[PDB]
Amino acid sequence: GLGKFIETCRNTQLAGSSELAAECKTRAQQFVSTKINLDDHIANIDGTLKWQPSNFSQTCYNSAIQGSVLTSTCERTNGGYNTSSIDLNSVIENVDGSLKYE
Numbered sequence: 001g002l003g004k005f006i007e008t009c010r011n012t013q014l015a016g017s018s019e020l021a022a023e024c025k026t027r028a029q030q031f032v033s034t035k036i037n038l039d040d041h042i043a044n045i046d047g048t049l050k051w052q053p054s055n056f057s058q059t060c061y062n063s064a065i066q067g068s069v070l071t072s073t074c075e076r077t078n079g080g081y082n083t084s085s086i087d088l089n090s091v092i093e094n095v096d097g098s099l100k101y102e
Contacts, residue, residue: 003093003102006068009034014065017057018042020088026097036092036099038070047076049086068092 006012009024010031018039023031042049044056049070056074057063062083063072073083093100 002090003100004089005036005092005094005099006089008094009099012065012067014063014070017060017063018055020065020070020092020099022099024094024097024099030097032097034094034098036088036101038088041091041101042070042086042088044074047074047080047082047084049074049084051091 005024009022012022015021019035019037021035024034025031039055039057040053042056043052043054044059049056060072060074068089069085069087071083071085073081076082091101093102
């Protein structure tokens, strides 16, 4: 185990250009509203989604999220557009109803 937020979270969706918002059950089995910012977490590396303190959004458009995986279209260094997918279930975690990067 190294996180697993999608296991205790529902209604996962993308907000803004690089934001993920969802509801996660707290210790008392109560579902609360929480959000994880991907702009400072996720980045765009040559059109590929990788973890780094850089906003992929600067080279990506039409960002979308489904469950625990993030789907977005990013520009490639050689020119053009390409969408990549990445699983954050490991990076993000559910801390008392809050998405945490650890």
